[PDB]
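Hey team,

Sharing the Spike glycoprotein run so nobody has to redo it. Sequence (1224 residues) first:
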Amino acid sequence: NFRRFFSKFNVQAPAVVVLGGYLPIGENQGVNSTWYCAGQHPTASGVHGIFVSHIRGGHGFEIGISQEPFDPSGYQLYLHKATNGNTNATARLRICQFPSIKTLGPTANNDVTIGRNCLFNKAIPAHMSEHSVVGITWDNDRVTVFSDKIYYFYFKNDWSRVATKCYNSGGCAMQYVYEPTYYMLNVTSAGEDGISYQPCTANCIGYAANVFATEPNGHIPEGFSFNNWFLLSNDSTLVHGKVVSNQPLLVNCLLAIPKIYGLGQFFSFNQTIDGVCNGAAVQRAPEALRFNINDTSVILAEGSIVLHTALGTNFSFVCSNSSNPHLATFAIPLGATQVPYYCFFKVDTYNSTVYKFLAVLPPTVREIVITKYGDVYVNGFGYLHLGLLDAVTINFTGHGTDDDVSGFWTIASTNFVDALIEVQGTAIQRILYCDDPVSQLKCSQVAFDLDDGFYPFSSRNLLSHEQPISFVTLPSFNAHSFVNITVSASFGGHSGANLIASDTTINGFSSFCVDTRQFTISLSYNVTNSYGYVSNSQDSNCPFTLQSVNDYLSFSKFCVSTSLLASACTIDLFGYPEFGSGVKFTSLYFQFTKGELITGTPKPLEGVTDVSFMTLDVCTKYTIYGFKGEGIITLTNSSFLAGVYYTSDSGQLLAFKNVTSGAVYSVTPCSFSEQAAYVDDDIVGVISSLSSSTFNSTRELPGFFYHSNDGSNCTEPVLVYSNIGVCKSGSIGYVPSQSGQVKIAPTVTGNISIPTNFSMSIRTEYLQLYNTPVSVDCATYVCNGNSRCKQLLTQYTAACKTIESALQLSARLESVEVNSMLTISEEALQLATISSFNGDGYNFTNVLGVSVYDPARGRVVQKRSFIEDLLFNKVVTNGLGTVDEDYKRCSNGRSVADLVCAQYYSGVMVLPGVVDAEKLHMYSASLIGGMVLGGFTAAAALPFSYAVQARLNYLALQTDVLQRNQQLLAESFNSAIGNITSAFESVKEASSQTSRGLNTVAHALTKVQEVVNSQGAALTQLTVQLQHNFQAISSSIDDIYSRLDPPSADVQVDRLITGRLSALNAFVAQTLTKYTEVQASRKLAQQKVNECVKSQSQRYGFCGGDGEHIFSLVQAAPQGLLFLHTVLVPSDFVDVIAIAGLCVNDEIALTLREPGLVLFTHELQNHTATEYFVSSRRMFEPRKPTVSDFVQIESCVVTYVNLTRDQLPDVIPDYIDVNKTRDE
Ligand SMILES: *[C@@H]1O[C@H](CO)[C@@H](O[C@@H]2O[C@H](CO)[C@@H](O[C@@H]3O[C@H](CO[C@H]4O[C@H](CO)[C@@H](O)[C@H](O)[C@@H]4O)[C@@H](O)[C@H](O[C@H]4O[C@H](CO)[C@@H](O)[C@H](O)[C@@H]4O)[C@@H]3O)[C@H](O)[C@H]2NC(C)=O)[C@H](O)[C@H]1NC(C)=O
Ligand SMILES: *[C@@H]1O[C@H](CO[C@@H]2O[C@@H](C)[C@@H](O)[C@@H](O)[C@@H]2O)[C@@H](O[C@@H]2O[C@H](CO)[C@@H](O[C@@H]3O[C@H](CO)[C@@H](O)[C@H](O)[C@@H]3O)[C@H](O)[C@H]2NC(C)=O)[C@H](O)[C@H]1NC(C)=O
Ligand SMILES: *[C@@H]1O[C@H](CO)[C@@H](O[C@@H]2O[C@H](CO)[C@@H](O[C@@H]3O[C@H](CO)[C@@H](O)[C@H](O)[C@@H]3O)[C@H](O)[C@H]2NC(C)=O)[C@H](O)[C@H]1NC(C)=O
Ligand SMILES: *[C@@H]1O[C@H](CO)[C@@H](O[C@@H]2O[C@H](CO)[C@@H](O[C@@H]3O[C@H](CO)[C@@H](O)[C@H](O)[C@@H]3O)[C@H](O)[C@H]2NC(C)=O)[C@H](O)[C@H]1NC(C)=O
Ligand SMILES: *[C@@H]1O[C@H](CO)[C@@H](O[C@@H]2O[C@H](CO)[C@@H](O[C@@H]3O[C@H](CO)[C@@H](O)[C@H](O)[C@@H]3O)[C@H](O)[C@H]2NC(C)=O)[C@H](O)[C@H]1NC(C)=O
Ligand SMILES: *[C@@H]1O[C@H](CO)[C@@H](O[C@@H]2O[C@H](CO)[C@@H](O[C@@H]3O[C@H](CO)[C@@H](O)[C@H](O)[C@@H]3O)[C@H](O)[C@H]2NC(C)=O)[C@H](O)[C@H]1NC(C)=O
Ligand SMILES: *[C@@H]1O[C@H](CO[C@@H]2O[C@@H](C)[C@@H](O)[C@@H](O)[C@@H]2O)[C@@H](O[C@@H]2O[C@H](CO)[C@@H](O)[C@H](O)[C@H]2NC(C)=O)[C@H](O)[C@H]1NC(C)=O
Ligand SMILES: *[C@@H]1O[C@H](CO)[C@@H](O[C@@H]2O[C@H](CO)[C@@H](O)[C@H](O)[C@H]2NC(C)=O)[C@H](O)[C@H]1NC(C)=O
Ligand SMILES: *[C@@H]1O[C@H](CO)[C@@H](O[C@@H]2O[C@H](CO)[C@@H](O)[C@H](O)[C@H]2NC(C)=O)[C@H](O)[C@H]1NC(C)=O
Ligand SMILES: *[C@@H]1O[C@H](CO)[C@@H](O[C@@H]2O[C@H](CO)[C@@H](O)[C@H](O)[C@H]2NC(C)=O)[C@H](O)[C@H]1NC(C)=O
Ligand SMILES: *[C@@H]1O[C@H](CO)[C@@H](O[C@@H]2O[C@H](CO)[C@@H](O)[C@H](O)[C@H]2NC(C)=O)[C@H](O)[C@H]1NC(C)=O
Ligand SMILES: *[C@@H]1O[C@H](CO)[C@@H](O[C@@H]2O[C@H](CO)[C@@H](O)[C@H](O)[C@H]2NC(C)=O)[C@H](O)[C@H]1NC(C)=O
Ligand SMILES: *[C@@H]1O[C@H](CO[C@@H]2O[C@@H](C)[C@@H](O)[C@@H](O)[C@@H]2O)[C@@H](O)[C@H](O)[C@H]1NC(C)=O
Ligand SMILES: *[C@@H]1O[C@H](CO[C@@H]2O[C@@H](C)[C@@H](O)[C@@H](O)[C@@H]2O)[C@@H](O)[C@H](O)[C@H]1NC(C)=O
Ligand SMILES: *[C@@H]1O[C@H](CO)[C@@H](O)[C@H](O)[C@H]1NC(C)=O
Ligand SMILES: *[C@@H]1O[C@H](CO)[C@@H](O)[C@H](O)[C@H]1NC(C)=O
Ligand SMILES: *[C@@H]1O[C@H](CO)[C@@H](O)[C@H](O)[C@H]1NC(C)=O
Ligand SMILES: *[C@@H]1O[C@H](CO)[C@@H](O)[C@H](O)[C@H]1NC(C)=O
Ligand SMILES: *[C@@H]1O[C@H](CO)[C@@H](O)[C@H](O)[C@H]1NC(C)=O
Ligand SMILES: *[C@@H]1O[C@H](CO)[C@@H](O)[C@H](O)[C@H]1NC(C)=O
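Structure output:
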């Protein structure tokens, strides 16, 4: 049955869900089964769960669970109900240090006494329905019981050994479970019905929406819900947008755990975490670990989170409703999510125990995340920080037992990575890792999809920085000095025991001070004794001696004095004559202050120079003659003589000269700019200045290198740039000069080729007509509504006023121009629908839009055409133009502002477009109906074939209007229209867009995309400027006025006022450029529609390029018109001999009146019968000549054909020989 058992996992009726854990293994499917249903007592080891499925009224039931080591100290379990009283027969249950019953019995053969120690020795009612299933599972010291509810109990245990006694119940009474299993619930109704449980394989684990299969590279697989995966911040959370941020999303191992189980686990930031990873595990030590949980009740237990620091300090996670652990108890007396819970960290160390306040716990904790460097986030916020973590222990307590295992609560080991994240409604929906060079380029911009084009790129530098340090500078000459000392003493006198005189000097002076870095002392000994010699000895009462100082003694100041000297240590000298007078010389003093300015040296080193050092041809940091930088130093073989360092005219260092050797070394950048040809959502080639890169082929273009994976010629350039083009396959090549359509130069004689076999092609061209008007509330944009800032802005006079006036004047001028342009005729509109139109042979179903009764306020509306549908839906990012938000609700303030209201709060209001797509399509339909309207009334609806025939006759008089002649043009036009429609439908498929370039569909759609993106880009660029702090103390005016005094604050806010005003002016200037450019576009469009659509043009090449223009039809397009100029292209040429004229009887010269008419001889009778035909030079329409087409000239010329009077009527059938007729 099992319906009642699975009904306990309370789940919503219409939800299909996945079950995991030690569940019943069924009866028939898989190995599983093993339903005993007998008193055979199978003793088993290593079992993790047991189940009983059918209670045949009241049959008995005996269970004994014990440790396999049979430990008497450990706790055993024995449950026994050998009674059939149902409700009144409560089962005797004992979780105790209990008799370890080996086989069977209430007491039985065993160890341990009955009641030496018990945790539970009461009786429990064990009555239930026949189909009710009871089960008990033990794992990780946690026990789950299925007695009508998912009861959970933490209990240290090791319960591998089981012994049983069953009683017969339907052949499926009792069974064991060794390993976890999985199930699928097709729940369709509440209660025990509408459950439809089935067993599962591993795939069902992947079915849960909150778990995923980790990629081998660690990337998050696509399509993940990210239902609770918040982005991690310290300060504030973005509500909507895209962010390139460093977040711990590089997942290594994912541990999906069913909600009904708690968890006792140990995690180390230094070792790969254990457990069965769902996807491809990566053996990398975690630096962050993220817990995704449904309900808060898991964490409320004290000690659930224990953080271990490298210092050994422990942080225990505690919660209560109280804010004073030191002044109150935290044993929880309340539950059921009542009252917000203050949650702290208690610090555990045997010096002083303190509590660190985490936060008021939010009502719904969904993900916690702890990470090394000492950081913890709850619901993606930086609540608290600590020192370097090294280990965590997780002690989690199941779930709320009211909606369980509708999936799995999951723990993820993650490493930090720079990723692009798209977030809406403060919830992540998609992510992109910034490791692939293609992904690196994507993250360089801010977008997930990138249009085809050449993008700037940085040359890949060294993976390991390890940059050596370079330093070049010629130093000063190492000046030396000799500090003389000379003592002059004439002693002895009489008998040698007397004195005569004594004196001493340093450098001929009574005092001296050392200046050079290197000094050497030298002492000299005038002692002249009248009796003989004198022994001289040196005393010392200083931390140094005259002999010691020379070695390496260093000072900041050193002065020698023969007399009193400030702060000077004393040194004396003794002179003993031959009989020992024993008198000192003059006392000597050193004033010394320690320092590196000077140093005592035993020998001078004059000539010693140079301390520079550098590394050649290695990307290194350098300090060259005061220029600090980072680059590559390379010995260059130039021969500069003057100068020591060389810089460009812009002040940039280029080369420096080793003065000692004369060599010169150039300094180049470590990395060079490159171009990536991002087409077809891939990097197909790189234009680089380097010799080689990570591509299979490299081609040496005249100006640069091109590295790609396709060395073949690029005959079909998908993306053209400068002098080159790149195909979709990565090939590069020069664009071949396409040969234009040949035009026959008119002439009077010789051969002439007349075009024929005309094929009716169509060429497309898009022309923008208007831009969306934008009003900028300058005052509130700059001052953010601050009155003081407005008063300061008043000092800037009329810049703001001019900005606003220019914007509004441009908007009004554009509006009035486009409004006066659009003229719509209702009679033409009547003929503009499929039912009214009769395009015999011409297939306008793609061009005409259907018109049906609109339930929206009754008024009838005409749906836009299929071509217009394709052009709008697939291009417009919002799908429809009505998506333009209204500011009516923007000031409501009851909801969090979106992007439109975000920019409106800055004073930017985007007025609706001047003309909606509905009116534009109406105008296009009016033009289409007008080109077939043959009169002032609707009854004059000329068939399109007649109109085409008239327009053809306009440029060349048709001589034989064959039905097949018109049918060929009709079918060619239909084929071209179908091809254009297919090209619009999709890119490079079902219509090969290999034929690409100007005047094609692809160019038009690229222009439309650029048009629809430019305005949004400009608006976002304007809005982001508010974030910038323009060299002020902050980007908030109120913050500046708070932290600063009024004097300095005015100076400070004046900095951003100029910055915002300058940024605002830049936006206005670029919009005026856009307005000026589009103005010329609509002037061309107005000229185009008048001279091409409403009437055929004699201006060759004006309407849709070269060729003979027959007509042109307009379709609506985003902020513009798409002209389809239909043009005739010749397919064959008839070669004829032009007749310059006739000279008949050598006396009458007769020529053709019409300059655009040629007289010739063709076909079999060009020379056999010498028959003449006149035809238009534009189209081959041979016709017999007429007397009205000829004029007489006063003189013949040699180029004219000889003729006689009798022969002329053969040439001219309409001629009447008046002399012959009158004389007969
Ligand atoms: C919320 O606010 C907290 C407050 O600190 C921020 O916590 C900091 O997080 C950053 C990482 O985001 C920590 O920086 C890490 O330092 C590690 C050790 O530092 C040494 O190495 C760096 C780099 O050589 C030296 O500059 C530094 O002086 C030390 O010598 C680094 O090894 C880490 O590098 C890792 O990331 C880089 C990418 O940036 C990889 O290339 C590396 O291979 C490596 O995987 C890292 O930079 C910082 O220590 C944390 N603060 C403190 C006080 O410890 C949170 O980041 C912030 N939240 C968000 C979302 O930003
Ligand atoms: C999960 O459950 C839904 C709900 O259907 C219910 O559960 C099933 C297990 C069956 O017991 C159903 O009888 C029960 O109502 C399943 O949706 C059901 O799918 C089946 C086919 O897979 C649908 O049958 C089809 O119905 C159409 C329209 O009547 C017929 O033309 C077909 O020939 C075929 O009979 C059934 O209509 C549909 N239930 C409803 C209410 O529309 C679902 O398949 C199942 N599994 C999953 C993965 O969702
Ligand atoms: C993991 O969390 C669980 C539950 O939060 C912890 O189990 C709990 O441990 C405390 C500490 O002894 C127990 O308190 C004691 O309860 C008994 C009654 O059973 C009482 O007589 C004692 O005076 C004392 O208050 C608590 O009962 C116990 N909870 C359960 C359900 O058994 C466990 O210690 C935590 N483990 C780690 C490693 O943090
Ligand atoms: C755990 O996840 C579940 C969803 O997987 C969420 O709780 C459940 O939310 C639904 C819809 O809000 C509740 O449905 C209805 O709730 C009432 C409450 O009395 C119930 O009586 C109705 O029959 C109906 O099922 C569902 O009860 C609820 N589950 C609970 C409360 O256990 C939520 O994301 C998480 N639940 C908690 C308590 O955090
Ligand atoms: C700039 O040019 C000068 C001039 O060549 C370079 O000086 C050179 O420096 C090296 C390293 O000190 C000298 O090598 C010598 O080796 C012998 C044997 O080990 C040792 O006894 C010397 O004391 C010295 O180290 C080399 O002779 C010397 N060249 C000379 C003196 O002409 C210098 O390295 C260049 N680069 C700079 C300054 O960055
Ligand atoms: C176009 O104009 C040229 C000259 O103005 C016409 O000349 C034709 O040229 C072809 C090619 O040489 C001649 O065919 C062969 O000529 C050679 C040399 O004269 C000779 O062996 C044969 O007579 C042979 O047919 C052709 O005779 C010559 N015809 C005339 C009237 O000059 C040419 O007819 C004009 N039309 C076309 C379609 O080229
Ligand atoms: C057409 O006639 C002109 C006029 O010349 C007269 O008619 C000729 C049929 C012949 O009888 C001439 O003697 C007549 O004077 C021709 O022009 C002459 O062409 C030749 C050919 O080389 C030339 O030598 C003469 O100078 C031309 N006479 C002029 C220019 O007065 C012409 O050749 C005749 N044929 C064609 C096809 O035009
Ligand atoms: C801080 O926590 C660590 C746990 O990581 C404690 O180390 C434990 O000490 C007990 C001593 O009774 C040992 O039985 C455990 O084996 C130790 N744990 C580990 C993982 O080895 C440490 O004593 C705690 N210190 C303080 C001051 O609370
Ligand atoms: C007094 O100072 C002079 C000045 O240098 C010292 O003379 C030097 O003596 C050394 C020792 O041989 C010579 O190598 C130098 O060439 C001498 N230099 C000069 C400029 O003469 C002298 O030694 C010091 N002492 C006395 C007693 O004169
Ligand atoms: C050029 O680069 C490609 C890219 O791997 C190398 O092989 C290509 O492999 C794909 C996939 O098997 C094939 O479809 C292509 O036909 C292969 N060639 C090309 C040019 O893409 C190739 O080994 C590289 N080196 C060369 C062609 O010399
Ligand atoms: C393909 O691209 C190459 C590279 O520019 C072109 O180079 C030609 O190579 C041939 C073979 O030696 C030379 O004879 C030509 O002089 C080269 N021309 C140029 C402009 O470089 C080549 O023309 C292109 N087309 C083909 C079919 O190889
Ligand atoms: C005329 O052009 C229309 C285009 O609207 C063609 O009609 C569509 O043909 C496709 C063929 O795959 C059908 O799937 C559509 O249901 C047709 N109707 C539409 C798109 O409205 C038509 O085949 C062309 N030729 C005619 C009418 O002779
Ligand atoms: C801490 O880790 C050191 C580095 O060894 C490896 O570290 C990470 C990257 C894992 O791959 C881990 O399995 C390796 O051991 C060890 O040298 C050091 O012994 C480790 N310290 C402790 C206490 O385990
Ligand atoms: C925290 O929650 C307590 C709820 O428990 C109830 O009150 C205690 C005193 C016991 O009597 C217990 O049996 C009750 O169910 C509140 O009483 C307590 O005031 C709360 N703490 C604070 C600071 O408000
Ligand atoms: C259980 O036994 C008592 C004693 O005879 C009796 O009164 C009671 O009705 C019984 N309960 C059931 C459910 O049979
Ligand atoms: C207590 O502080 C002293 C400070 O010298 C330190 O040496 C000692 O290890 C600390 N004791 C503990 C248990 O942290
Ligand atoms: C000391 O030596 C100096 C060296 O110049 C000499 O001139 C002088 O006569 C000597 N005797 C005395 C007493 O100075
Ligand atoms: C010095 O000149 C030679 C001339 O053959 C040249 O090959 C060499 O590259 C030059 N040195 C450097 C560093 O370029
Ligand atoms: C094309 O022109 C040739 C001669 O110029 C003619 O014979 C043919 O009928 C025309 N049409 C087609 C379809 O070839
Ligand atoms: C596209 O043009 C070719 C050549 O004119 C024609 O054969 C083909 O039928 C056209 N495609 C469609 C869909 O009409």
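The first helix runs from residue 3 to 7.

Ping me if you want the raw files.
A.
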